[PDB]
Each structure stands twice: as structure tokens, then as C-alpha cells.
Design a protein around this ligand. Structure first.
Ligand SMILES: CC(C)CCC[C@@H](C)[C@H]1CC[C@H]2[C@@H]3CC=C4C[C@@H](O)CC[C@]4(C)[C@H]3CC[C@]12C
Ligand SMILES: CC(C)CCC[C@@H](C)[C@H]1CC[C@H]2[C@@H]3CC=C4C[C@@H](O)CC[C@]4(C)[C@H]3CC[C@]12C
Lengths: 380, 84, 161, 388
């Protein structure tokens, strides 16, 4: 067919304006407002926002000619996802009261989609990303509601499954897309994003923790695990590379290995040495995944998936120390995996529809598909 | 409303075009890879040509057990989009 | 109605409907509100059989749209390799300029269509032809980062047809 | 003279030291101050680095202008609140000094690429004087509610810069310029400033808000206004461009108009849906301004705005002031109608008059103004590396 992109002058603005108007109307009908630690509580959500926008926007900008789309589409996705997550977390947990904690939780739900989109960025336009954001937030909320109904846990506390849900959702959606690279200034901008993610990830591991000592220990464990994982990832990149050189792309994803591996159990680890052991094991597993997963589309999302599975497994191991609960926790994990895969399949078959005007497979990873550039022939 | 009356295989002219005139002027002998022309006669006039074209297909079989795997059976429509 | 149906059939690739319309008396040179005839639409959508059939029925090959684009311009911008090949095989001017000064080589280079660029260079496309901005296919491929197109344009140089 | 700029910088710094020694004496708001600090120095500075050959000047003159600005704004804003007497320095003084720096940087947006660092020091001093006087007027004589400063900061800086750029009009730059063009990695760098401004704007509108319900309302309203503004700016950028393409100027600037137009109503009880309505209107207005009003201002009104600070700060700031008036109309605040309207009018008029005077001063050929051919070029004032 025609490799020149179809005009989105009527699809994209109508779609986005309709979405925004619907969100406004729903907020008017269902949302409402209403101290000493206002700034301290605001800080956690602000750290989440800095990570979601900046780190997850620049981390996937390593592409030679898709940095614009990565950053701006991440910003758009976060802006839509926070509003939709506010509404849907209000609907599936009860009128909707907007506190800073609710905005923080909506930011976490948006970060789930932002992590998933890294497996499909460069192969989709903005409308497909809107569909992904809506369906993925809906699926995550449905998963949390199902877990809360079956295992009698809190709906907001079920958001700890978001690493593994996002990883498998992204893998499943990327598997359904049609099938088909780096520059130096784009890789440096991506290091900036990865550094911000790595620096503020102790906020990811304790937004849902109320007791101050639990947040204490979670942040300590995440900080030390992330340090060990940085050392292991930078040093072991040479082994998991054909030319025995360090890869900036591997380092960008693998620096978060320790934070992912201890994310579900950072508040249960009693001593920093155990968190450091977990970070080291996560780094070694990241090296092994880099050396093995391409043999058996995005390798960084595959290693993120395996790391999230490892984090859930070490949660299972550590919770016994602190056998029916083992079966219940494996059941919760399997239900999360099944729902993530099924919703990713549904999203992938929804994204393959002709109405979205997806870019041609020869036009992937190119900003010229979506953006204005000078001295170009336009139209026919 | 697409009943066939008869089919003229046009053996003389096709055989002349396919260098098989010395074989026969009544039996159709054609050489592969070269187009040959037949005339299809309908019992009643065809009102709308395009829907009638959508409703017809042709099949060529050779041998006693024609199959698509042996390339002894072929089914093709009548259209300008056919692979010449 | 008849001309609109013929142009719709040309866009969709329905060669039987388009041939029926031409049989009934629809002018083959009719164009839409943007100046695109059936050849332009078929070249846009990569319908090689429709392009060849319309060329047989004496369509004007060098008819430009309201933007000055020929069928070769549209086929190069759309990256239709076989349509570009057939249009050149039937005598399309590879060095045609649009209203803003774009050549088929420029549209192929700006869109990272390496096969179209290679075929146009092999058919005597002159890469020194600049637009009204002074931009060359090499310059627009450098700006857009199309490294394979830049390399092929530099390596070809002035080998000609 | 090549020694004019170091002379003025040294003399201004010595004057700042003397004034601090004459007038200045010696923790829950420090994180918000640091967020505002990040906005002032990274967001504005790198937001302006879209020009392909002016990134050094953009970020460096941003840093220099804001560093002079915080000191001079500290001095001027204290001497007004102290009525000529000695005053103490806390976190709020620092926050207001960064606000004065923000106003000067917004005006610097209008004259980017066509002015020298010496002109920048002069405009910093004069504009901070005018801004602080107008802000004192609004905050104490009118006593209007402008906690996010859609009027006193954004509209003031935009129309001050527009007046200066109108006085500094060059006939040879009306039809465009060869150096006035963005690059690919330049827009990638400008996205850094855009993202930091977007992330930290809720702290900008809530730093000096009254602790309690007002500060929380400022945070939440700013956040949801920006969330709606991003979607509407993307939609209208696609709407106004050929084939629905996205314009990086729009995504870089119009995505932040919601934080400007919600500033007056930030602490008011306008509800999250009202804040989202304001943000959507701000994004649409900013995109329309960039598409249509900027060419009309450059070609017909002979006002050239380099960064389009009208479409980001002036029109959204005017919309914010009007939204404050409408919120006063329907009981969202206890402030008077006429005081809000007088604050808007005084801000715009004082900005225009001060910009006229400052631009007339900056028009004297003593500051090393660049030639018409040398506009938007780092090499006039910087040593530039051989490769990008
Ligand atoms: C701040 C803006 C929006 C409103 C007020 C701006 C007015 C006062 C400014 C901006 C446009 C300016 C004019 C633009 C161009 C020139 C040409 C120059 O050779 C003499 C000054 C003159 C004639 C300016 C006079 C002052 C002017 C009219
Ligand atoms: C841009 C100019 C024309 C200003 C007009 C902006 C409009 C759209 C804004 C400004 C003031 C806003 C209102 C301020 C106060 C109220 C009452 C409150 O309980 C709900 C929100 C509501 C109902 C807002 C709705 C939107 C609003 C009317």
C-alpha cells in the first residue's frame, strides 16, 4: 500500500478533543475536592511524576530518529492516563474524592502504561497509544478489583503487581503488532532519563506504605539494591556483548534491576545486606538475559519481565519467613499474569484495526511520520 | 440468471495462434504460457455485468485425480486482476 | 457520478469497474477536486495493473495535479517501487519538477525510499536539481537522517543513466 | 567596546553587594523553593535552546539574567515590603526573587537572538523595578488574588517583552532569518525544559499560597489544568498543521499554557473540572496564537517574538485574569471584581510602559547589539566548537 502516512488532521484532533471533553464531563459529574505534612505527602507524588514524565520519556529516546515522538508521546500518555486512572480508581473502589494520595496512585497506574509502551514505541501513532492507555488502565484496575474481591486485600495495595503487569502487557501488545538504530546525543538524553529513574525509584517502592519505618526500610533497601545493580550491570555488560564493550542501551535498562527485584519485598527485607544480595543477583540475571534472550522483540522488556517475575518469586520466598499462603500468592501471581496476557492480546488486536492509520512497517522508528519538518514535500 | 448456453473454444483461430493448426481445426490444442480465447454464450441477456462477473469462476483439471497440490487442478476467477 | 465512481474504482484498485466505466464513456483524463486523475490514484495506492491498463487506454502520462505533481512524483512519494518502475518503463519524465520545485528523486530521498532512489539514479535522475529553497535530495536526506539514501547518493555521484 | 559587558557586570555585582550590606539581615517551603529554582534555571533556560545556533546564549544568558535577577529582585521587593527599612531574608524572599527572575526570563523570550548580554543586564534591572512596583500595587493596594501570577508574572513579562521587541524592531528581520530555525537535537534539548516546567508548575502556583486548603487547591488545580492542557495542545497542534502533523513549537510551549491560565484561580475553589476546562482553553488559545497571531504580529504589527512568549504567557495570562474575574462572579473567591480587573489592566499597562522605556534605553548603540545578519548566532558572544 501507500508508505506515505495518511492524514490524521481529522482523526487525531477529534479523538483527543472527544477524550478530553468526556474526561471533563465525568470529572464534573463524579469528582470532588476535600495540613501539617502537605508538602511531604506532595513530594512522593511529585517524585513519581518526575520519574513518569522525565525518566520514562527520555529513557526510550535512544532511537536515532524517534526521540521527539518518545518524549512527547510519553508526556501525552501520562497526561491522559492520570485523569483516566483517577476516574477508574474512583469507580472501581467505591463519589470520587481527589486527594494527593489518589493523584499519586493514578500516577502509578499511568507509569504502568508508560513502562508497557516502551515495547511498542516507534511502531504506533498517537491514537493507538490512546487506545493502549485506556485499555491498559482499565485492565490494571480490573485486575486490582478482582484480586481485592478474591483474596480480600485492599484495592490500592494490589498496585504492587504493576511491574509484572506492565512488562507482560507490553510484551503481549508488541507481539501482536506487524513486524519490521541508535545515535550518541539521543543515548546521552536517555542516560539522563535512566539516571532520574534510578535516582527516584525508592519512591516507586514506597508510595503505598503508611508506616514511616516501613517506608524507611523500603527506601534503604531500594537504594542499596540499586547501587549494587548499577555496579553489576555496568561491569557485566562487557561479558554480555559480542564485542566485549559496555552497551549504553543495556545499562539504561539494567540499572533498574535491583529496584525491580526488591520492589515487592523492600519493606520485608530486615537488613541491607539481603537487599544488596538481591540487587547483585538481579544484576547477574540481567547479564544472563542480555546474553541469552535474543537467542531465544525488545530485549530490555524481556529482561524487565524476567526481573519482575524474579521479584515476585523472592517475595514468595521471603513471605514464608515473615504453606497455604504460598499457594494463595502463586495464585495471585498467575491471575495477574493471565489477565495481563489476555488484555495485551485484546489491545493488540484492537491496535491492528485499519481505522487507526498506523505507520507502514518500513516507516517505523521515524519522527517524520508524526512531526512537521522543513523542506519536505507535503501531500499529493 | 446466468445460465450458460454453449462455449465456443474457437479451435481454428487459437490453434493457428498457438502453432497447432496442423493438428486440428476442431480440437483445441494450446501451448502453455500463451493466452487463448474462448466465447461464452448465455441463454438470456446479462443485465448487470459486474455482479455477474463476481459470480463466475473457471476451473482447469488434468489427469484422473486433479489436485491443487499436484498443480493438476486450478481455480481462477474472470477478472482484470488475474495473474497473466 | 460516473467520473466519481471511476476515480473511486481507480483508488480502490477495482480494475473491472474502471474498465466498465471507460467502456460506458467516462473520460479517462477526469480528475478529482485536487487535480488527481485515475493514474495518480492508482500510482498512490500501488495498483500496478490499473496503472498499466490506464496507460494502455491513452491517459496523459505527464498530467500534473494542483500541486504540480505527476504520477511519478506521487509514486516516488508513496514509495511504490513497481509503479515507479512501470511509469519509467512507459516514458515518465524522471526529472519533472512540481510547483515548489520537487523532483521524484527528492520525494524518494526525503521519504527514505532507497529502492526508488536507486532506480531513479539508474534512470538518469539529476540530483543537482534544487527546489525553491535551494535544497537537494542529498540535503533533505542529510536533514532527515536517511543515512542509506545519503550513502547511495554520494556513491552514485554522476554516473548518469 | 568589548569591555562594556564585564564593566557593567562587575559594577552591578558591587552595587548588589553594597545594597545587601545596607538593607539585608538574616524550612517547610524549601522543597517548593527548589522546584521553583529548577523551573527558573532549567525549564526556561533549555526551553529556549530550540534555536540551532543560539543554545549557548539561550542557557547561559538565562543563567546570568536570573542570577542577577534574584539579587536585584530580593533588594527591590524587600525595600517595598519594608518601606525603605532593613528586612530579613527567609524562604519566601528567595521564592519571590525567583519569581522576578521568571518575569525577566519571559521578557527575554521575546528578544531572544536579537539582543546582547549587556542589553540583558539593563533590561533585567529596569524590568525588575517595574515588575516589583506593579506586583506591590496588585498585592497591597488592589489586594487582588494572583497566587499563580497569571497577571503579575506571565502577562507582565509577555507584554514587557513585546513592547521591548517592538521598540527594538529590525526591518531586515521581518521576512524571517536564516539562523532563526530549529534543529532536531535542539528541539530534543528544548523538551527537557518543557518537561521540567510541566512537572514542577504545581509548586510554582502553590509556593507562596496560604497553608491549608489554598495550597492544596493550588497544587491540584495546577496539576489538572496542565493535564488537560497537554491533550488540548496536542489536538490543536495536529488540527492546525498539514496532514495532522505535530509542531514541536506547539508541543514545547502550548503544553504549558494551562499552568499559566490557572494561576489566578489556583487557590480558589474552582474544582478540578473547572481547572481542566481552563487548561483546555489555555492550550487551544496557545496553539491558535502560535499558528495565527505570531505571523500577524511579526509581519503586520512589526513585533517579533522569538519564542512566542505572547502565545504562552500573555494570552494565557490574560485568560487567567479573566478566569479570576469570572470566578469572583460566581462565588469562587471573596476578592472584589474591580480589584481583579484593575490588577489585569495595571499589569498590562505597566508592562507596556516599562517595556517602552526599557526598549528605548536598549536602542542606544552602546551595548554591542548584533547586526541583522548575525542574529540568532552564538559566535557573536561565544566561542563555538567546530562540530555539533
Ligand atoms: C506590548 C504590545 C503588545 C503593545 C504596545 C506596543 C507598541 C507601543 C509598540 C510595539 C510596536 C511598535 C512599533 C514597531 C515598529 C516601529 C518602527 C521603528 O522604526 C520606529 C518605532 C515603531 C513605529 C514602533 C513604535 C512602538 C510600537 C507601536
Ligand atoms: C477565558 C475567559 C472568557 C474566562 C472564562 C473561563 C471559564 C470557562 C471558566 C473561568 C471561571 C470558571 C468557573 C469558576 C467557578 C466555578 C464554580 C465552581 O463551583 C465550579 C467551577 C466553575 C463553574 C468554573 C467553570 C469554568 C469557568 C466559568
Amino acid at each position: 500500500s501507500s508508505k506515505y502516512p495518511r492524514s490524521v488532521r481529522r482523526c487525531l484532533p477529534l479523538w483527543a478533543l472527544t477524550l478530553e471533553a468526556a474526561l471533563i464531563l465525568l470529572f464534573y459529574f463524579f469528582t470532588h475536592y476535600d495540613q501539617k505534612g502537605l508538602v511531604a505527602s506532595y513530594q512522593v507524588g511529585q517524585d513519581l511524576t518526575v520519574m513518569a514524565a522525565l525518566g520514562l520519556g527520555f529513557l526510550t529516546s535512544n532511537f536515532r530518529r524517534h526521540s521527539w515522538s518518545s518524549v512527547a508521546f510519553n508526556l501525552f500518555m501520562l497526561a491522559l492516563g492520570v485523569q483516566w486512572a483517577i476516574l477508574l480508581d474512583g469507580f472501581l473502589s467505591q463519589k470520587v474524592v481527589i486527594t494527593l494520595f489518589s493523584i499519586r496512585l493514578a500516577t502509578m497506574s499511568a507509569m504502568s502504561v508508560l513502562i508497557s509502551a516502551g515495547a511498542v514505541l516507534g511502531k504506533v501513532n498517537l491514537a493507538q497509544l490512546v487506545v493502549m492507555v485506556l485499555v491498559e488502565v482499565t485492565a490494571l484496575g480490573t485486575l486490582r478489583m478482582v484480586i481485592s474481591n478474591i483474596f480480600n486485600t485492599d484495592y490500592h495495595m494490589n498496585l504492587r503487581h504493576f511491574y509484572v503487569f506492565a512488562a507482560y502487557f507490553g510484551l503481549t501488545v508488541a507481539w501482536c503488532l506487524p513486524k519490521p538504530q541508535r545515535a550518541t546525543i539521543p543515548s546521552l538524553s536517555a542516560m539522563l532519563g535512566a539516571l532520574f529513574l534510578w535516582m527516584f525509584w525508592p519512591s516507586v517502592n514506597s508510595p503505598l506504605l503508611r508506616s514511616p519505618i516501613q517506608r524507611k526500610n523500603a527506601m534503604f533497601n531500594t537504594y542499596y539494591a540499586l547501587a549494587v545493580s548499577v555496579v553489576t550491570a555496568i561491569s557485566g555488560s562487557s561479558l554480555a556483548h559480542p564485542q566485549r564493550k559496555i552497551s549504553m542501551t543495556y545499562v539504561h535498562s539494567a540499572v533498574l534491576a535491583g529496584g525491580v527485584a526488591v520492589g515487592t519485598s523492600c519493606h520485608l527485607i530486615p537488613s541491607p545486606w539481603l537487599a544488596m544480595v538481591l540487587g547483585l543477583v538481579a544484576g547477574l540475571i540481567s547479564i544472563g538475559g542480555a546474553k541469552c534472550l535474543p537467542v531465544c522483540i525488545s530485549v530490555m522488556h524481556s529482561i524487565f519481565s524476567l526481573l519482575g517475575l524474579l521479584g515476585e518469586i523472592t517475595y514468595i520466598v521471603l513471605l514464608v519467613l515473615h504453606g497455604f499462603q504460598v499457594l494463595l500468592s502463586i495464585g495471585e501471581l498467575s491471575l495477574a499474569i493471565v489477565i495481563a496476557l489476555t488484555s495485551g492480546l485484546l489491545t493488540g488486536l484492537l491496535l491492528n484495526l485499519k481505522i487507526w492509520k498506523a505507520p507502514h512497517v518500513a516507516k517505523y522508528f521515524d519522527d517524520q511520520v508524526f512531526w512537521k519538518f522543513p523542506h519536505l514535500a507535503v501531500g499529493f | 440468471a446466468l445460465g450458460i448456453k454453449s462455449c465456443d473454444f474457437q479451435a481454428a483461430r487459437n490453434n493457428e495462434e498457438h502453432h497447432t493448426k496442423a493438428l486440428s481445426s476442431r480440437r483445441l490444442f494450446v501451448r502453455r504460457g500463451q493466452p487463448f480465447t474462448i466465447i461464452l454464450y448465455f441463454r438470456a441477456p446479462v443485465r448487470a455485468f459486474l455482479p455477474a462477473l463476481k459470480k463466475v469462476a473457471l476451473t482447469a483439471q488434468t489427469g484422473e485425480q486433479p489436485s491443487k497440490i499436484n498443480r493438476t487442478q486450478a481455480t481462477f476467477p474472470i477478472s482484470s486482476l488475474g495473474d497473466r | 457520478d460516473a467520473a466519481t465512481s471511476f476515480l473511486r474504482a481507480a483508488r480502490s484498485g477495482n480494475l473491472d469497474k474502471a474498465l466498465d466505466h471507460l467502456r460506458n464513456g467516462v473520460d479517462i483524463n477526469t480528475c478529482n477536486q485536487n487535480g488527481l486523475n485515475g493514474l495518480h490514484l492508482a500510482s498512490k495506492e500501488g495498483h500496478v495493473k490499473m496503472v498499466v491498463e490506464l496507460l494502455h487506454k491513452e491517459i496523459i502520462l505527464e498530467t500534473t495535479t494542483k500541486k504540480g505533481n505527476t504520477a511519478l512524483h506521487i509514486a516516488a512519494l508513496a514509495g511504490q517501487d513497481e509503479v515507479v518502475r512501470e511509469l519509467v518503463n512507459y516514458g515518465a519524465n524522471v526529472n519533472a519538477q512540481s510547483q515548489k520545485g520537487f523532483t521524484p528523486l527528492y520525494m524518494a530521498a526525503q521519504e527514505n525510499h532507497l529502492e526508488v532512489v536507486k532506480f531513479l539514479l539508474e534512470n538518469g535522475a539529476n540530483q543537482n536539481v534544487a527546489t525553491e529553497d535551494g535544497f537537494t535530495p542529498l540535503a533533505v536526506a542529510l536533514q532527515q537522517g536517511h543515512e542509506n539514501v545519503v550513502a547511495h547518493l554520494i556513491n552514485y555521484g554522476t554516473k548518469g543513466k | 567596546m568589548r569591555f562594556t559587558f564585564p564593566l557593567m557586570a562587575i559594577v552591578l555585582e558591587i552595587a548588589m553587594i553594597v545594597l545587601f550590606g545596607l538593607f539585608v539581615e538574616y524550612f517547610e517551603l524549601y522543597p517548593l523553593f527548589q522546584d521553583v529554582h529548577v523551573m527558573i534555571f532549567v525549564g526556561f533556560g533549555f526551553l529556549m535552546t530550540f534555536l540551532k545556533k543560539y543554545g549557548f546564549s539561550s542557557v547561559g544568558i538565562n543563567l546570568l539574567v536570573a542570577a542577577l535577577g534574584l539579587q536585584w529582585g530580593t533588594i527591590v521587593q524587600g525595600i517595598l515590603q519594608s518601606q525603605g527599612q532593613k528586612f530579613n531574608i527567609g524562604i519566601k524572599n528567595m521564592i519571590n526573587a525567583d519569581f522576578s527572575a521568571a518575569t525577566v526570563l519571559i521578557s527575554f523570550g521575546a528578544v531572544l537572538g536579537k539582543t546582547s548580554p549587556t542589553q540583558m543586564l539593563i533590561m533585567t534591572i529596569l524590568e525588575i523595578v517595574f515588575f516589583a512596583h506593579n506586583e506591590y500595587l496588585v498585592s497591597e493596594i488592589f489586594k487582588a488574588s494572583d497566587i499563580g501570577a497569571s497577571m503579575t508574572i506571565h502577562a507582565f513579562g509577555a507584554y514587557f517583552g513585546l513592547a521591548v521587541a517592538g521598540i527594538l524592531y529590525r526591518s531586515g528581520l521581518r521576512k524571517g532569518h536564516e539562523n532563526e530555525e530549529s534543529a532536531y537535537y535542539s528541539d530534543l534539548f528544548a523538551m527537557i525544559g518543557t518537561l521540567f516546567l510541566w512537572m514542577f508548575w504545581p509548586s510554582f502556583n502553590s509556593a507562596i499560597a496560604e497553608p491549608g486548603d489554598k495550597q492544596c487547591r493550588a497544587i491540584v488545580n495546577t496539576y489538572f489544568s496542565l493535564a488537560a492542557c497537554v491533550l488540548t495542545a496536542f489536538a490543536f497542534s495536529s488540527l492546525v498543521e498539514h496532514r495532522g502533523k505535530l509542531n514541536m513549537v506547539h508541543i514545547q510551549n502550548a503544553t504549558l499554557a494551562g499552568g499559566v491560565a490557572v494561576g489566578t484561580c489556583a487557590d480558589m475553589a474552582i474544582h478540578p473540572f473547572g481547572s481542566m476546562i481552563i487548561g483546555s482553553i489555555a492550550g487551544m488559545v496557545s496553539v491558535l496564537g502560535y499558528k495565527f497571531l505570531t505571523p500577524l504580529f511579526t509581519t503586520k504589527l512589526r513585533i517579533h517574538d522569538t519564542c512566542g512568549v505572547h502565545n504562552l504567557h500573555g494570552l494565557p495570562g490574560v485568560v487567567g485574569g479573566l478566569a479570576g474575574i469570572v470566578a469572583v462572579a460566581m462565588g469562587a473567591s471573596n476578592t472584589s471584581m474591580a480589584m481583579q480587573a484593575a490588577a489585569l489592566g495595571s499589569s498590562i499597562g505597566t508592562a507596556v510602559v516599562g517595556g517602552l522605556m526599557t526598549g528605548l534605553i536598549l536602542k542606544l548603540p552602546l551595548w554591542g547589539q548584533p547586526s541583522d545578519q548575525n542574529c540568532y548566532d552564538d559566535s557573536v558572544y561565544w566561542k563555538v566548537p567546530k562540530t555539533r
